[PDB]
């Protein structure tokens, strides 16, 4: 199966997230998050089968991540590199 | 691994400014949901109380995540 994403990539991504909230992860924890990332990705493909601005804001609201488009581009600001979140703001 | 590199990953498994922004926002969603899973794992680690977020905590986080979504 070609779907899996690497454990090292998850380590690099979550290292920055540890600073916002310090999660500490044993090895088999790393392996389980890597394994269940496949299930997460499939569930997301169910939840988001196609990409649109209204569709993605509605999906993320359904996910409980956000409450409105305001929260959505707040998330984009806190998750993207500087020029990009402005580029997305041009899209909204 | 960049957030736009996560967008590149989602592009590789999925298939120009509009689509660029769409895929960047999809990467934001994926990253946020990974963070949610890890945060719920930490929450489960609080219920058990030992040192670190042992794997069954991420597991339980995933079942709660699916049971609420």
């Amino acid at each position: 199966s070609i779907k899996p994403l690497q454990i090292m990539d998850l380590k690099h991504l979550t290292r920055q997230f540890l600073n916002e909230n310090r999660i500490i992860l044993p090895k088999q924890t790393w392996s389980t998050i890597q394994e269940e990332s496949l299930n997460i990705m499939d569930f997301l493909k169910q939840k988001i089968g196609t990409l649109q601005k209204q569709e993605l804001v509605d999906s993320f609201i359904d996910m409980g991540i956000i409450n409105n488009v305001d929260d959505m581009f707040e998330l984009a600001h806190e998750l993207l590199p500087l020029e990009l979140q402005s580029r997305i703001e041009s899209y909204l | 691994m960049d957030t736009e590199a996560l967008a590149n990953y989602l592009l590789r498994q999925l298939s120009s400014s509009q689509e660029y922004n769409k895929k960047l926002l999809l990467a934001c969603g994926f990253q946020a949901i990974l963070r949610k899973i890890l945060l719920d794992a930490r929450t489960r680690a609080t219920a058990e109380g030992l040192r670190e977020v042992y794997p069954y905590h991420i597991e339980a986080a995933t079942q709660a995540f699916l049971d609420s979504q």
Partner: peptide, 27 residues
């Protein structure tokens, strides 16, 4: 009767959990 899509629109809703949001149905 032949079209199975109309049947599935009812099957999936009872199939998957109610909290499993079927807001979007992939091709």
């Amino acid at each position: 009767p032949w079209e199975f899509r109309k049947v599935i629109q009812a099957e999936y809703r009872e199939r998957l959990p109610r909290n499993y949001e079927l807001k979007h149905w992939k091709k």
